[model samples]
Target chain A: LIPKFREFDRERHRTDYQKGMSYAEQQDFDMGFTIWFDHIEDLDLIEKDGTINRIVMMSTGLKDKNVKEIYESDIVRNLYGELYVVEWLDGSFVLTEFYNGGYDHYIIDSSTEYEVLGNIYENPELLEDDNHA
Target chain B: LIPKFREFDRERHRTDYQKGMSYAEQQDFDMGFTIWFDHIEDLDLIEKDGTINRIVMMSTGLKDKNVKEIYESDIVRNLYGELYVVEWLDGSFVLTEFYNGGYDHYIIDSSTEYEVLGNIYENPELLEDDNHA
Candidate 1:
């Protein structure tokens, strides 16, 4: 599975996929470390090690109504105007309402009509209200 | 300020702005309720009474890098790749990191290079990770 890593240096931030960085898991002595390359040609070092907060794997192969690739954190609005966030729960990617109290969870697949609105990071207010327009 | 209202009927959902409905705050006897007209000519009643969960106001007069108007729950990314969610804090609109652990808050205005990524309702994943791409 290909994973995207979020890199943070002081006040700066970026992801491996955005910078085209490569990932590799390695062990040095008794400790393990992750390596990220800036580019394949330059072989420049990006980050040697970091915490578990950097990595996010791609979602299962599913595309939205606009043919946009779906990710674990992408928010989708169905034909009913109900908004659901794509989340990795129970070893599978499922569409869940942000404030789901008694709502049913739907497994994301190729048999649904969902329009990607945004993801959680950029749109926290979407979850604050149950009735999202 | 222009306000958007979400309308829900059983399992169906739609917004006043989406359906080109007009809004008017009116008081009837000792009770107060909102009136939403389906259209100017048709004058069809959309929803007579509902909770306050369906309303969201527009943000202050500030546009993103692409000239898209900023709203209350929009998420923006800067040149440094740092992600910030637009919020209405204090007496003005401000940009806040979802997890502001000792981070400084910036007031949103016309003096920033913030790019509108998506809104909270559509993109919840952008806020979950600190270093969003």
Candidate 2:
């Protein structure tokens, strides 16, 4: 199970980690951070600092109906147009209904078809619509 | 979430519950059993008894790459030919590698493509191969 990493740059106000960027962990005295390199010889583009928020998500090892890779915090829609947020809970990935104070969760199985709409980070509005819930 | 039920008949040596069959719980004195009916007017076909074993699995609300429904105890294989079993553990359904004393598990998300292989009940041999580990 290979792990994928991404980070949000508070200074740039965007996700700074791009695909194909090599990354490694670094320690600066008592502080710890991650460094992303564009290439082996290239300088680091992003480093974990006070303004960086590193988000690490493990692969679920399953793909959606659209062939899109699913990860934690990803929002998916069923055939009926119901939206659910993918979450890692209790040692498994579950599709949880939009938060309406509380949520109803179910396992990610092959019982129904699902399409990846977006994720909680880039598509927060998908889960925020009160009417959808 | 709608619930689906099935039962194994040790007397008949087969799964007695058929599709479109209606089911309900029954109490015989202090003993409890599930009853399956062919129709509203039909008599019970199978009832839980000393020889009957009931199996219940909740839907994962997601479909596999082949559009097959995913459920607990369902075995799935990724593109790499890696086999995993769907299980309800720690309050959520997880894709677990076959038992080899210890197992590696991951959450079910849309990260990789998977196909339904066979269920543990019908295909127990898939997880019993010592060389596959």
Candidate 3:
């Protein structure tokens, strides 16, 4: 890993995972998660739903670490937390913060708008460490 | 709340929460985040790096339920999953699917593309049940 990764040590990581699983156990966690996951699965999302929503989240250290790995992972294109949406959907559910979200739309596709959204989110490191320089 | 909320109930809802918290805790969970959260908190994100990416995810029943509530909540304005980015960021971590994502952006304020992504996600009832039928 990167030397800067002092943030992720082995024992600490173990604790982090345990906490994440605990939080995941909260009531109504899965079903709600599925709808959102489906949102990710549908490639023709814009046609099916129209748009993908940006999610916001406020989390404790353990939760934050797990999510952090998510952001740092190869699978994750681009992600944001620090006072981000913390979950932004509609008038369908309650407790928005812990929940993650998005609409169904092709970032570089759908409309001209997604191209920008897709660009920033799909790739984040580009925004870090003066890569542009 | 909504007409199609047949998916929820007192016990079922209770079960969702129970499961969510149980799942939240696991080994190696925290400590890896402070870095990522700082990402969202930082406003000059673009000045630093230069991109926003997408995320992808997969899940089970209980987990999906809770996440869905987040999407439906008013606090959450827009979100996606279902062929959408399960969790978008970069390789600094692992297990991306359960993780949610996005970069810090003003959406309509950041770029016009978010204007569209935001418009659709921040407003989902628009996409479902044909509105009050």
lDDT of 2 by residue, B1-133 (tens): 0223333222233435534222233211111112232322122422343121234344455578988766667788888877788876543566877655347465455623778877776667778766322
Which tens-of-lDDT digit does each residue in A40-78 have in candidate 3? 222232233333221212121122223342211112122
TM-score of chain B of 1: 0.56
What TM-score does model 1 achieve against the real structure?
0.33
lDDT of 1 by residue, B38-127 (tens): 222222322344112233334445667888666666778887877777764422345776665535254435425778887665566777
How does residue A31 of candidate 1 score in lDDT?
12
Task: Write one digit per residue (lDDT tens) for candidate 1, span A11-122.
Answer: 1124433442222331111111123322222212223441122333344456688987666667788888878887654223567766655353544354258888866654
How displaced is residue A81 in candidate 2, in Å?
A: 1.4
Tens-digit lDDT track for model 2 on A1-133?
A: 0223333322233335544222233211111112232322111322343121234343354667877666666778887877787776544667787655347465445523778876666556777676323
Interface DockQ per candidate: 0.01, 0.05, 0.03
- Whole-model Cα lDDT per candidate? 0.46, 0.49, 0.21
- Deviation in Å, model 3, residue A117 alpha carbon: 16
In terms of DockQ, the best-performing candidate is: 2
Give the 10-residue window scoring lowest on summed lDDT in candidate 1 chain A.
Answer: A25-34
Which segments of model 1 are wrong by more than 4 Å?
A1-52, A99-104, A110-112, A130-133, B1-133
Q: What is the lDDT of candidate 1?
A: 0.46
